[PDB]
Amino acid sequence: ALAAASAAAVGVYRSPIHGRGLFCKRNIDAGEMVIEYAGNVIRSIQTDKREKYYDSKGIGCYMFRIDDSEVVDATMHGNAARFINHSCEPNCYSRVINIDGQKHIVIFAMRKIYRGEELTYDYA
Template structure:
């Protein structure tokens, strides 16, 4: 099933200082404001785990309801939000939606980052966020 997320604030995808492509804000965002929701294909957690084993660099988010959002083919800009150990956004999962909110006020052209928490990389992917207090691995 396709999950079509809405994006509320203006964002753009561009090369990131952290890793690959990143998402940047086209406007000032006040703290706590909703940025938008992730788009993806809704699949079972089982299918998701099988897929990330075969393609470790995939965009995949596990949900609380036992499903997962696969952003490898169908996705929106928010799939490119990079991890930071000192992020400016946070993620909230309600049912099949993964929502992003501003953790603090965000400047125009600032990269949006989120703490991924536990990932399918099992601590094997080096973190490149470069912030003070970086945990080192994802």
């Protein structure tokens, strides 16, 4: 697993792309699991309403689209992976994986990443 490794590998700081982003604290090998997109799998029919709720309470909403019927809501139970910004020439990608029966969104490195480099991936 990697729940341990991740805190030592990545960190959250300001990003020239937008807002805060996830940056690399130590070199990450191409192929390496960088981090999980922690959250709860909700049915994508509920993203509209949940987002209404969060916007009304001034909570920042973080959601990751698994597919056309499930998204991972990271607003309340996420982790640092919700700050990963988008790029069309990224250095990461999402993959849905299955561990003992549970879905998981895990971020992998496309190339080797170097200290201080923002981590990105393609949204759509």
